[PDB]
């Protein structure tokens, strides 16, 4: 049976040939004795292409086309791809990586031949993770509890102080206070009103030495006044602050 | 040079070949199980005991693995595996969560050069180390949670060798009888069948 | 599932998986093969599967 | 118009269905392409 081929190029053009010494692989010269087995060996081994069974009356015809995706990419430690060159594929020292597990063959069917027919999951991390802010790779150890996120972003602390300094109609004996406080506010994230008592407590508990070294306690008390005025302090603690102060 | 270029080429070729073999596997095996460990191993031993829970499609087995890490703490490990024990069953084949799990970790000084369980007692195993001696352990006497400190009870190490080695064999008929073989050009034989004063 | 449908997964345009082989490792193969054949002449004489001497 | 014109980067501005040998025709295309018969499969 004379066998023929046809080489498609997205229909912009093409080329056609004919198999000589057929039933032997046009690439690996593998002697398949059936159109069945030959079609199998072709659509599996020489997989980087695609095929189709046409059955020209002369015995066999196969119009071939290129594979479209053919996801062939390195299958190893997915990290080596980015090692600065000369070190990649070192293959000369044990290296640690994340654990994974796959399954491919579980229970076969074992059917029979049928020419009419001719016409795998994961468990674990399977990719390369990146740093949130620099787009760089992520070592398998760096991906530990370090979570590169918390409530206080540096740039924010800077921005707020600066914005405060825009104000003209304020004394340094006030701006310094407002900043020293708002920063500590950010540092812990106070929400509930039942916290405000403990709040001013811890505040001086930290900034004791400074306000003394600042000699700024008197405006601190003015602030305590304001805050009680806003119904969050009781008089039963305002003094108590100046007490704990010394 | 040349060898570098050549090795790059060879690597790419091997990659291609593995791609092909994977594409071709389904018509070839009755089971395919692959799993990646963090650090490689140098040992292999199937525990001679098996349990098969009912109402399911799979057995359960325990494996004896070693560890040769780069620099960090070494460990002796034994883990679990859920082999399908069925002919009609096939998420994947059984449960969806996991088919493999670690269960036994023990601190270890140096890498593992060899490890075999004693035929008379599977709870008894041996160990070849980068050192010039032998270590024995019984896992049932140590918690799976490893000593965060590090080195622990050597559990009756041995003596009589001067360089490391790899030979290891209990006598099947006679308990305690165990052979060794190291770079010392020698074969050393202990008999721990009875060592009260360890 | 214990038994689902056959292998089906497709959309408009999935990302391209960035094939591995490079021209730089490709051309060496070509060159090597050329001088090999001109030492061997198999595509001409050995039909790709038999070696001349 | 001047404050309305977008700025610009650049200026204004086979017949013979012979055989498999087409393969052996393709990979050597210089420096003694053997078999001397592949040129017909140009």
């Amino acid at each position: 049976l004379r066998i023929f081929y046809q080489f498609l190029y997205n229909n912009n053009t093409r080329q056609q040939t004919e198999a000589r010494d057929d039933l032997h692989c046009p690439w690996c010269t593998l002697n398949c004795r059936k159109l069945y087995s030959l079609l199998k060996h072709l659509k599996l081994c020489h997989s980087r292409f695609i095929f189709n069974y046409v059955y020209h009356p002369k015995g066999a015809r196969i119009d071939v086309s290129i594979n479209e995706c053919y996801d062939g990419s390195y299958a190893g430690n997915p990290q080596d791809i980015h090692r600065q060159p000369g070190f990649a594929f070192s293959r000369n020292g044990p290296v640690k990586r994340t654990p994974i597990t796959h399954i491919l063959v579980c229970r076969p069917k074992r059917t029979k031949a049928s020419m009419s027919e001719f016409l795998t999951y994961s468990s674990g991390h399977n990719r390369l993770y990146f740093h949130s802010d620099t787009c760089l790779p992520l070592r398998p150890q760096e991906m530990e509890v370090d979570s590169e996120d918390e409530k206080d972003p540096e740039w924010l602390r800077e921005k707020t102080i600066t914005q405060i300094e825009e104000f003209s109609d304020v004394n340094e004996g006030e701006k310094e206070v407002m900043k020293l406080w708002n920063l500590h506010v950010m540092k812990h994230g106070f929400i509930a009103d039942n916290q405000m008592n403990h709040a001013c407590m811890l505040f001086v508990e930290n900034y004791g030495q400074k306000i003394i070294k600042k000699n700024l306690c008197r405006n601190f008390m003015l602030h305590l006044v304001s805050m009680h005025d806003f119904n969050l302090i009781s008089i039963m603690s305002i003094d108590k602050a100046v007490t704990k102060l010394r | 040079k040349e060898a570098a270029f050549d090795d790059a080429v060879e690597e790419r070729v091997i990659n291609e070949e593995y791609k092909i073999w994977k594409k071709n596997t389904p018509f070839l095996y009755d089971l395919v199980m692959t799993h990646a460990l963090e650090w490689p191993s140098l040992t292999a031993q199937w525990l001679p005991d098996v349990t098969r829970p009912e109402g399911k499609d799979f057995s359960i087995h325990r494996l004896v693995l070693g560890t040769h890490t780069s620099d960090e703490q070494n460990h002796l490990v034994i883990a679990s595996v859920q082999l399908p024990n069925d002919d009609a069953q096939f998420g994947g084949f059984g449960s969806v969560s996991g088919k493999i799990e670690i269960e036994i970790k023990i601190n270890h000084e140096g890498e593992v050069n060899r490890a075999r369980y004693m035929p008379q007692n599977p709870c008894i195993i041996a160990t070849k180390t980068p050192s010039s001696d032998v270590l024995v352990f019984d896992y049932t006497k140590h918690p799976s949670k490893p000593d965060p400190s590090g080195e622990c009870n050597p559990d009756l190490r041995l003596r009589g060798h001067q360089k490391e080695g790899y030979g290891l064999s209990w006598n099947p008929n006679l308990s305690g009888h165990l052979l060794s073989a190291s770079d010392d050009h020698t074969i050393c034989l202990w008999d721990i069948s009875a060592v009260p004063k360890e | 599932n214990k038994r689902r449908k056959l292998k089906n997964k497709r959309r408009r345009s999935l990302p391209r998986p960035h094939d591995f082989f490079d021209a730089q490792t490709l051309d060496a193969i070509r060159h090597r093969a050329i001088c090999f054949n001109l030492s061997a002449h198999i595509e001409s004489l050995g039909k790709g599967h038999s070696v001349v001497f | 118009r001047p404050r309305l014109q977008a700025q610009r980067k650049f200026a204004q501005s086979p017949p013979p269905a012979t055989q498999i040998s087409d393969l052996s025709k393709r990979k050597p295309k210089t420096e003694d392409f053997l078999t001397f018969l592949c040129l017909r499969g140009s």
């Binding site: 080489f7 053009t13 690996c28 010269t29 292409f49 290129i66 | - | 082989f21 093969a33 | 990979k27």
Partner: peptide, 26 residues
């Protein structure tokens, strides 16, 4: 239609299997 496109494209996969042919044969 610079047919070198059709050429260059199908050029690539060929040599690979070609090498692979010999390799596997041995």
């Amino acid at each position: 239609a610079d047919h070198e496109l059709f050429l260059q494209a199908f050029e690539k996969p060929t040599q690979i299997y070609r090498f692979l042919r010999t390799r596997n044969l041995i």
